[PDB]
Symmetry: D2
Subunit: 330 residues, 4 copies
Amino acid sequence: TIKVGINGFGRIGRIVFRAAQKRSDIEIVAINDLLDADYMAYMLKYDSTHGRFDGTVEVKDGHLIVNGKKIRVTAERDPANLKWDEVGVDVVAEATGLFLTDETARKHITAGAKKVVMTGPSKDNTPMFVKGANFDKYAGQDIVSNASCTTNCLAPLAKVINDNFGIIEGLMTTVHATTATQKTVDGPSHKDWRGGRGASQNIIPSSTGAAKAVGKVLPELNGKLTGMAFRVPTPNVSVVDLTVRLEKAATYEQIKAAVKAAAEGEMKGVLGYTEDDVVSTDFNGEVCTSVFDAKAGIALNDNFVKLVSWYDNETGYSNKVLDLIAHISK
Amino acid sequence: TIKVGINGFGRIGRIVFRAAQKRSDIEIVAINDLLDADYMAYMLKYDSTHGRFDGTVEVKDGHLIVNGKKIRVTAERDPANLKWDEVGVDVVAEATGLFLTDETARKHITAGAKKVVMTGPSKDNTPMFVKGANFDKYAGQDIVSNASCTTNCLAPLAKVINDNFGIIEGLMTTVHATTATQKTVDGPSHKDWRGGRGASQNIIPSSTGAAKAVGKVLPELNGKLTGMAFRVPTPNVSVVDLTVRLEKAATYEQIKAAVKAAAEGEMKGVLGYTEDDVVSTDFNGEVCTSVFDAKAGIALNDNFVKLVSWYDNETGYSNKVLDLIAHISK
Amino acid sequence: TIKVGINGFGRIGRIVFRAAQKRSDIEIVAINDLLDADYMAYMLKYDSTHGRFDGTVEVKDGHLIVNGKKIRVTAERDPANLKWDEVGVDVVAEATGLFLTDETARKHITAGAKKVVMTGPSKDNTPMFVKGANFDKYAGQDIVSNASCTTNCLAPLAKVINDNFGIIEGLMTTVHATTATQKTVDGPSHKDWRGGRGASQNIIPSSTGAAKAVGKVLPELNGKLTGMAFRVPTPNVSVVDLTVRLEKAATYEQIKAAVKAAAEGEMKGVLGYTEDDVVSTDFNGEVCTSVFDAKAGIALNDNFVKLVSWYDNETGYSNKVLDLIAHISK
Amino acid sequence: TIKVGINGFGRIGRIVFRAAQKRSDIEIVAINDLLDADYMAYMLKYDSTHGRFDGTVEVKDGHLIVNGKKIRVTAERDPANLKWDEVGVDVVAEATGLFLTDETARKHITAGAKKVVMTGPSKDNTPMFVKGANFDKYAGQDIVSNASCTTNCLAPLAKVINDNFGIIEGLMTTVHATTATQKTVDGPSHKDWRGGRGASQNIIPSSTGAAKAVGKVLPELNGKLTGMAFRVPTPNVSVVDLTVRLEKAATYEQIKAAVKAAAEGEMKGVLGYTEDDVVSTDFNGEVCTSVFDAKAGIALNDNFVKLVSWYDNETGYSNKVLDLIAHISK
């Protein structure tokens, strides 16, 4: 099995931990964050969004014991001190949000790990990979990025649409759940003023590079997409709303049939498909990073259409972080 | 002054009542609904969304007395019994949602009123009017409709964009506040399954004819727009997100300048314009039916752009119901 | 196995259905409500609060098929037409809220069922039973009531406290999740004005007979308790806050030890006990009708103390409805 | 007029600023916080909870100009550098939460201010004052504290009840709105684990010294009260639920009449009284620190009763901070 260390025990670090438990190719052996072991046990055991941990959690002498396995718990602010080799870590899941460049994330390799996967879009030229879009493009690099939750939703859908019908241009909106970077009441957020306003009171317009970033994992779509977001008062699960102009005329039935084929074929497990009367909570826990909502979309004509796709911005992304860890460890 | 009777004391009936108080051309003299006078006084006095009534409210012997004026209170299920002439009603504000055809709403005229304004889109060919779009088209009809809250947001913005640059085609999404037709928890809604799901838990996809209905008040845009909606867990204020292809190339600065000109000129008071870091609560109480958010929109190129416009789906619409009452009473 | 029919497919009807699936002594064979079979399948399959149904749901020719079993689906407004004997129903779970008297609920027996369990407090002298309090008092009656969700929380806790230390007098508050009887925005509720105000905007004071009703299942506490409620913007899970004067002086450690003993002994499975840092979502899905929160309570002195106990007002109650069905079928 | 400087522009700093504008005895002349002037202008202009600022706000060259008055804007981390005398500050409103001891808050006097009012409970023996309870006890001190929002609700009510009937012992619960110290989703809060859980998802048990602190401003009640809190998903307005044993037997009508007398007499303006069907939003903007809810309370007998009182935990407290500034400047 691949021995994984988690750096940062935020939302993504903890949901990656939970998703790792169902896997037989990957073992979390260590967690680093500025939290005591008994508190980490608490955050793992109880989740407001995903329920109680399915398994056993205990602290025996500053060591986490999860389903019988000792997890090493450290609290290093500098990843060079992490001594990953002492616990045998093959790949670090870098989930603090603070080491999104090669210079910073390579400190993990200095500390004894073989490879690193950033759980967010890289801030330099570190390559990005989205499952369903460009995993096959991986060329042995030792530091990679899994891009963002919204890019993971948009890129697989956009590849299906573009491969079958040709995207001339698209604009996307994501109606996005509240996240940890928001405020409970109007508070300070000096780099993003709207984002300081009270999260449960407001529809909050927000920026995103996810649509532009699609052009990085799918360079044929480079320059052809952009978008924005609205944050709304839900705790989890988001939806993209993709408005595209198509080169080849395609009825809505043809679009539906092409997405369903992908979801049952090449993109099984990353792209999903539904025709039911779903709402956002129906995707709480969803492992597909992109579930096409057939009934919700609408076409003006055969070359101009709005497509709707759901994603659990915690769970889907976290599972594909693991998929990327497995893929680069092959 | 124009003597107005309100039929139905729901959200729209009560916010129309409140907005009428600041006006000197219009007096509410009667309210019909299946509510006792003391309960009507209660619903008027306290509003979770808009605060305490600014004025005095008392019940003296089954008569509402609001800022010193007797309001006649009745509870007729059939509008033919309403005897509007006994209290001198010129125009009925028909706000029950149940009499959206000519056959049904004309019962108000049978009962002694001169004209009727439906506070929702008509279900037959009753003409619709949206301020900023086609009030000038009013040709003396005695039963009219003020269309819907979302059409009132979309149509003025779409006229500016189309008059300056030519809309080839557009698709719109409205991120819409929760409304009275939704459920607090998962409950029955047999004509709209998604709409029964718990309103505060969910992003809820929803249908709307508002974009198509733009082609009725602005027939030059007929067939050129459609859209859908998402209901989200906020109590009031909605936003349209309009993705349009433009005939004439127009930079985002040119679009901004053209909307701002309209908001300071022909469409002053219906179309607003802002460049601040607004969120939805900043428009709670907004009287403009459409406030353009300059910072939130985004263009892919000079012919393909996404435009953002805010509306208080209670307050703006309610004020324009009054504007339509005044206009047809001229 | 006991063959059960469900009358009414609201929140309680559906959660009773889900809880029945894990049981081997009880089979739901029929559901009556004014809903088509395909819509019932939809409400069963997707739950905003409890996630996707764990099993299979299909409609084959107006018949529900759930985990392989045909469920008879009818839509009778009058229970005398229900023909329960045609599908072999031993006990009806009466969960519409409309037949809470002997005269009305006996229509189920007229229709071929042996016994009836009302899923709410009876409105006449129909006996009430709360597990942990007075199931042993059941004397063969053919129509019974499982009281209310809040009585099911309060009565087991109050019996432990009173048996060990003697309750002189108590006042309780329940901070209660939003329910189906509330409104999404300020709307009409003529029998309960506060309860019409928008559920997600407000703390809403509310009445309850649950504390008084404790004196019916535990007649030694008759006249010794009363209380009220606040409804708050959460979709599920409530908490009682019980302030009692004690006859025998008892430290908080003694109270803790006595509740823990009950939860591990006589009241195992109905009364739970925790010392963790729980919040309300940690009890979403809880089967115990009363989980004592050791850390949250506080004593002023050894004879005056405030006790805190959690309950999933959907899940716990629904499971004990089944327990009562099993108990009276013995 | 009294020249006031505000240190810290959080929720309390900004609502104190807004409340100061209606006053003619007090002028805010300076604000210190780690925010640029244009951002301070933004936070003042738009409030999710209290609406748009009623007045004019502009930035002219790093100076705030509010309703025509220059406000000095600084960003000192150490209050000794604040040079309050350069702008003529008589009293500092210390609202950062970081200088709640005499040693730390006296740095404001070192910097040229005459007196200091802490906008929270002091952490040393700095005296506390609650209007309606012990303002008359002020003995000329130059550093004081206005205690906490919840003590400001509880102490005036408890004085009325104790003066008329004698409180033997009381236990209180406050159902409290979400605050800035909570998290939007499950996040880190190592000193208070429950308080890290997602604020909009949860009822969250919480500690409070407000009931004990009543015994400091009203020493006759020392040792006679304690309590706890639940945080719930509302953005503003809280309620105390006070369970008391009374020495002198008193019907609920007698309790009502005694609170109403206080609210119309000695405690006019701090203690309010209502018999309407209010919910929490009806007190958004409330200036009374304690509004007795006559209909919501309940008595078990003439010596054991539960009393309900509302407070806007932002607005009421902020106004009494100003009242305390005025009182000590007399």
